[PDB]
């Protein structure tokens, strides 16, 4: 019986399984 | 109510609804003090589903015509079982809860949900 | 029945006592957290002044200052807590993270995430997503070393995207990131705490309009930027912890307030049942006695 | 027995009276089975949806400690 169970369980298969802020740096130089 | 008399799908839907409602009733004891925070999300999903499905059972029968000032509604059972299967699938979690309060059908459900 | 009522009464009383004690302890810890958080201002101000003054007359060229020419991917970091009973803190953080993910989805860029804290780690573990690394065990009490190592890892990951084209890592050898994000919560008031997500990976310059560098100015600039990144990362943690504790306190307060009414209602029910039982017994015994 | 034999009821509770409002009328329990003929047409037209608005206000007030 256990051999048959092992054989079947080998044969059997399982069917289951904007809002974004930004961090900057400040420069005293005037904008080029 | 029995699979001999009625089709299997109706039986399965009723069983699943009963199971969900019973589990929510069981969790009611814990939730009544702390809240939803202590529970895991694996039960948060069930809590939300139970809330929505229980709110869906409301209806506006015509006998309230002299009270609510609105006409009644009629729903064939095929549409009912289809809508309840769809809801038990869990797709409709996006919509807000208050949409389902006193609704007639799934078309009215979608119209009310999108109008708000 | 009677015994069940007494048992529930005893349990509710014990629960109320425990919740009150926890609330008082959290209120005590709030003051120490507030004292600790406000001690990093001078160093941050001085390092910002140093960086601004050094970069004022310096050339504007750095990998953290330049941008990748193509939108390959964008990294993100999510903070959390290390204990439960915090209320909607975790829910708010996760909702902000989800909305940021939805925003970045419009560009078609596949994101990569880093998680800190046990609760959020488990929550994403149940979901189907990848986690590069997890840091746990120090959210309650932070220190500079963890922030420094986190900043070093993130900067190295950003640097690893010099020539990442398509699926080709190039000479780097590993596929790297092109953008980073920070999600946390700030401390607006004792009762005002709102989640904030901000972008800080590539620096940018805004001219506000209108010394002597003994070593190489470029060398000083390149050495200084990682210190600034690490200081910002360190500054995040204290605010996170303070906001967490402030959110924690109100939950215990409301728990005790809600627990009292259960005691009241159960007491009323028990008294009613006792009166009904005694009156039924006396009615039955008098009816039996008079019948003879 | 009396609420079964009669139709309609008005509920007065000590909570609101102790709070400070003198006319203590609850909004979620007091339902009268009277028809609309009792109210004048002007009264019905001017006033509507008061009970539902008060019920939802009494539901919302429980979260006055969370403005987020």
* Domain boundaries defined on chain B: 1-116
What is the layout of strands, in order, in the sheet containing C195-199?
A: A21-22, C195-199, C182-185, C73-78, C110-116, C134-135
Residue B81 to residue B56: CA distance in whole angstroms: 13
C128 interface with B at CB cutoff 8 Å: no
Residue whose token pair is 């809508």: B83
Residue C134 to residue C119: CA distance in whole angstroms: 11
> Which residues on chain B are in Cβ contact (under 8 Å) with C84?
37-38
Q: How far is C226 from chain D (nearest CA, A)?
A: 35
C86 interface with B at CB cutoff 8 Å: yes
Size of chain D in residues: 68
Count Cβ atoms within 10 A of the Cβ of residue C183 and give its class: 0-12 exposed, 13-18 middle, 19 or more buried. Answer: buried
Residue C203 to residue C221: CA distance in whole angstroms: 13
Residues C45/A21, Cβ–Cβ less than 8 Å:
no
Angle at C19 between CA C14 and CA C22, to 5 degrees: 130
Please confirm, yes or no, whether D33 is among the known catalytic residues.
yes
Q: What is the CATH number of domain C21-250?
A: 3.40.1380.10
Residues C197/C182, Cβ–Cβ less than 8 Å:
yes
**Torsion angles phi and psi, residue A22, rounded to 5:** -130, 140
Q: What is the resolution of this structure in A?
A: 4.4
CB atoms D68 and C92 under 8 Å? yes
Taking alpha carbons only, the member of C254, C263, C261, C252 closest to residue C18 is C252
What proportions of chain D, in percent to the nearest 5, are helix, strand and coil? 50, 0, 50
In the DSSP assignment, the letter for residue C78 is E
Instruction: State whether the Cα torsion B16-B21-B22-B23 is positive or negative.
Output: positive
The whole-angstrom distance between residue C86's C-alpha and the CA centroid of its chain comes to: 10
Residues C245/C25, Cβ–Cβ less than 8 Å:
no
Residue A28 to residue C54: CA distance in whole angstroms: 11
Residue whose token pair is 């006396």: C282
Count Cβ atoms within 10 A of the Cβ of residue C60 and give its class: 0-12 exposed, 13-18 middle, 19 or more buried. Answer: middle
Alpha carbon separation from C129 to C72, C82, C132, C158, D62 (Å, rounded): 19, 21, 10, 21, 37
Residues C262/C13, Cβ–Cβ less than 8 Å:
no
Chains B and C touch (3+ CB pairs under 8 A): yes
The two tokens of residue C104 are 């970045």
CB atoms C193 and D68 under 8 Å? yes
Specify the experimental method: cryo-EM
The whole-angstrom distance between residue B82's C-alpha and the CA centroid of its chain comes to: 12
Greatest pairwise CA separation for chain D in angstroms: 48
CB atoms within 10 A of CB C280: 10
CB atoms within 10 A of CB C157: 18
């Amino acid at each position: 019986l256990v051999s048959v169970i092992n054989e079947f369980k080998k044969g059997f298969q399982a069917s289951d399984g904007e809002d974004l802020e930004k961090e900057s740096v400040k420069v005293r130089k005037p904008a080029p | 109510l029995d699979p001999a008399i009625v089709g299997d799908e109706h039986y399965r839907v009723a069983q699943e609804v009963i199971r969900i409602l019973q589990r929510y009733k069981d969790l009611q004891d814990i939730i009544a003090i702390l809240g939803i925070d202590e529970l895991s999300e694996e039960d948060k999903q069930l809590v939300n589903r139970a809330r929505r499905i229980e709110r869906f059972l409301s209806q506006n029968m015509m006998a309230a015509e002299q009270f609510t000032g609105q006409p009644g509604s009629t729903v064939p059972l095929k549409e009912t079982i289809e809508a309840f299967d769809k809801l038990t699938k869990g797709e409709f979690d996006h919509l807000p809860e208050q949409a389902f309060f006193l609704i007639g059908g799934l078309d009215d459900l979608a119209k009310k949900a999108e109008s708000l | 029945t009677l015994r069940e009522l007494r048992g529930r009464i005893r349990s509710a009383g014990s629960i109320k006592k425990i919740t009150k004690a926890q609330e008082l302890i959290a209120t005590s810890r709030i003051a120490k957290a507030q004292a600790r958080v406000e001690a990093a201002r001078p160093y941050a101000a001085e390092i910002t002044n140093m960086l601004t003054e050094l970069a004022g007359a310096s050339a504007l060229d750095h990998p953290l200052l330049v941008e990748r020419k193509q939108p390959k991917r964008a990294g993100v970091l999510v903070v959390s807590s290390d204990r439960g009973l915090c209320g909607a803190y975790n829910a708010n953080v996760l909702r902000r993270a989800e909305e940021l993910f939805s925003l970045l989805r419009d560009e078609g860029k596949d994101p990569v995430l880093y998680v800190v804290g046990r609760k959020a780690l488990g929550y994403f573990s149940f979901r189907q997503r990848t986690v590069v690394e997890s840091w746990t065990g120090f959210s309650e009490r932070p220190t500079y070393e963890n922030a420094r190592e986190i900043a070093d890892t993130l900067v190295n990951a950003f640097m690893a995207g010099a020539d990442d084209e398509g699926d080709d890592a190039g000479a780097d050898g590993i596929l790297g990131v092109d953008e980073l994000h920070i999600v946390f919560t700030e401390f607006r008031s004792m009762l005002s705490q709102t989640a904030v997500a901000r972008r800080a990976a590539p620096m940018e310059v805004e001219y506000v309009g209108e010394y002597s560098f003994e070593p190489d100015p470029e060398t000083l600039f390149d050495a200084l930027l990682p210190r600034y990144i690490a200081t910002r990362v360190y500054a995040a943690l204290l605010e996170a912890a303070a906001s967490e504790s402030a959110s924690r306190r109100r939950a215990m307060k409301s728990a005790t307030d809600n627990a009292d009414d259960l005691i009241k209602a159960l007491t009323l029910a028990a008294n009613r049942e006792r009166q009904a039982q005694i009156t039924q017994e006396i009615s039955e015994i008098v009816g039996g006695a008079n019948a003879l | 027995n009396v609420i079964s034999i009669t139709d309609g009821q008005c509920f007065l509770e000590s909570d609101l009276f102790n709070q400070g409002v003198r006319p203590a009328i609850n909004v979620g329990v007091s339902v009268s089975r009277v028809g609309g003929a009792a109210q004048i047409k002007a009264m019905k037209e001017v006033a509507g949806s008061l009970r539902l608005d008060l019920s939802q206000y009494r539901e919302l007030e429980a979260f006055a400690a969370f403005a987020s």
